[PDB]
Ligand SMILES: Nc1ncnc2c1ncn2[C@@H]1O[C@H](COP(=O)(O)OP(=O)(O)NP(=O)(O)O)[C@@H](O)[C@H]1O
């Protein structure tokens with residue numbers, strides 16, 4: 195059945211890293227851009243540091259350790275990298291810096307510069323990340339474009355594991371949830387597929403809000419009626435049909451992530467045949483400071 199989990203959790207000295215700038219604040223906590231110098235190693239690693247609200251209420255500490263636990267246990271090019279934790283008054287989470295931020299803000303900001311090749315490659319990459327999670331039997335439960343990060347315009351990774359669970363275990367983003375999850379709190383790899391559909395639609399509409407202005411309470415009814423998100427203007431029926439499949443009532447009738455990898459990948463070989471974007475053919479998409487000889491991306495920093 196279940197193999198032992200031998201992932202290493204790395205605990206990092208507060209002195210090994212400098213904060214440098216705030217990236218995001220308010221709500222629950224703060225995320226900083228920083229550099230990490232492991233002890234005596236002659237490398238500087240750009241990182242994000244997730245130190246929650248100074249309020250150290252035990253409830254919050256247990257949630258961040260759940261994240262660390264999940265992120266320490268994954269290892270895939272399309273899933274966010276945990277570097278370690280820092281155990282100061284409140285627990286800091288240290289991840290690979292994803293310089294271009296979250297994919298939702300990135301599509302919203304760069305609408306006029308995003309071609310079909312990038313859209314379809316992101317779909318392929320997110321499907322790969324999700325398939326890997328499926329191999330490790332994790333159900334993410336919060337896939338959305340706000341939970342995908344951008345290392346470069348050509349390289350994205352799934353983030354936010356603070357609701358992830360194993361398939362089976364029993365232990366609220368309404369507009370991204372499969373109907374069986376809104377109704378019965380059932381969560382499967384196939385409910386993740388539903389959310390993949392929504393995430394794709396967010397990308398294809400360059401950041402629109404699904405069911406914009408429709409209160410959450412209505413959502414389950416609308417879905418039961420048989421209503422779904424509408425076809426984005428740039429989408430051929432080929433792409434939109436993939437979305438709609440991800441939104442079938444019968445969970446087992448939805449595609450598997452491995453099929454999504456395959457379909458989007460065929461599409462990515464001829465992107466203009468599948469997404470129709472004004473000016474596509476002409477679209478195109480310088481690091482830290484001065485002492486940057488020793489900088490190494492996390493993806494090139496490997497640990498025995
Ligand atoms: N590894 C990272 N690299 C760069 N920016 C990041 C990173 N992690 C988080 N951020 C920034 O911080 C924002 C919020 O991070 P995150 O902690 O995921 O959001 P939150 O609202 O605190 N809760 P959630 O989004 O549900 O995790 C993201 O949209 C990014 O803009």
Ligand SMILES: [Mg+2]
Nearest residue numbers: 222354355356
């Ligand atoms: Mg969170």
